[PDB]
């Protein structure tokens, strides 16, 4: 049998925290793959936690950096503007459509070569009459239907998170990387040898606040678009905000990134929040003009 020790320990820990504080709601944030089932041989049983279903944990949460769309689609992505008549290099609708359709549900990359060739391979099951149920993409769907375990490939009737309406999902972390592009890798945070440090595969060196705009607000709209806003819209915390860096004025928002952070040493577009010029023009026209 495969009872992961960390999860068992977590259940015990949850009870202890609840005892210390009734008010505190305990949530374990998880990878998008972890939220459903991380595909594995013999660990294909759903990674959805029995603990998430369990009462002691009071909330279910995701550290979600799952790509809204994948930048490595070559011409098919945001380089499709001339060919497909796409209006802008950064198009909100297109990324939103990609997540909704099934980014990484039908858009996973089988090989590094696939990323290099800029093509996404569809994944589907239907063996049990069920579509790929380990879809990284499904979250509202994951909440909507209790997801049965798939141990060792073979399907299991029992479902982790047996009640479909489990504790509400939490958008604990989300957002685009500081650099340009990065739709393909939104988990990129500057560092040394750690996993987050690695940049998106073909992302431009120049930083883009607009890419953050492409995530953040569009992602919120996408969640509203999702039929059930299981995710905590109120608590949709983005990855970065701070006091010390770039302190021309304590991380002032309308700046691309670095300011007089040189004494400290910093590199983050995310904490600062940009203001879009085009929208402002339209409202100004209506009233001021």
């Amino acid at each position: 049998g495969r009872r992961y020790p960390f999860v068992d320990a977590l259940r015990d820990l949850a009870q202890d925290v609840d005892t210390i504080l009734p008010t505190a709601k305990i949530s374990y944030a998880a990878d998008w793959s972890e939220y459903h089932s991380h595909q594995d041989a013999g660990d294909l049983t759903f990674h959805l936690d029995p603990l998430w279903a369990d009462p002691a944990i009071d909330f279910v949460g995701i550290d979600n950096y799952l790509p809204l769309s994948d930048w490595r689609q070559g011409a098919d992505h945001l380089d499709y503007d001339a060919t497909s008549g796409r209006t802008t290099p950064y198009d909100l609708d297109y990324l939103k459509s990609n997540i909704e359709g099934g980014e990484y549900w039908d858009w996973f990359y089988a090989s590094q070569e696939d990323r290099d060739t800029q093509t996404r391979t569809p994944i589907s099951d239907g063996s049990y009459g069920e579509p790929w149920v380990f879809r990284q993409k499904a979250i509202r769907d994951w909440h909507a239907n209790a997801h049965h375990n798939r141990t060792a490939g073979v399907r299991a009737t029992t479902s982790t998170g047996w009640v479909p309406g489990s504790k509400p999902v939490w958008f604990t972390e989300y957002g685009c990387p500081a650099v340009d592009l990065g739709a393909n890798r939104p988990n990129v945070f500057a560092a040394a040898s750690s996993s987050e440090s690695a940049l998106p595969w073909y992302s431009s060196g120049l930083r883009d606040d607009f890419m953050q705009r492409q995530y953040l607000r569009a992602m919120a709209e996408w969640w509203t678009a999702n039929g059930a806003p299981a995710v905590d819209l109120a608590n949709c915390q983005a990855w970065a905000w701070d006091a010390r860096p770039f302190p021309e004025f304590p991380l002032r928002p309308a700046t691309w990134s670095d300011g007089p952070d040189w004494r400290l040493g910093h590199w983050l577009n995310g904490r600062a929040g940009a203001a879009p010029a085009a929208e402002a023009i339209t409202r100004r026209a209506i009233t001021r003009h």
């Binding site: 977590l10 949850a14 505190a24 709601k25 305990i26 949530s27 944030a29 604990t172 972390e173």
Partner: peptide, 8 residues
């Protein structure tokens, strides 16, 4: 109001 266990 809320608590977290492991971020990832």
């Amino acid at each position: 109001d809320a608590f977290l266990v492991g971020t990832e």
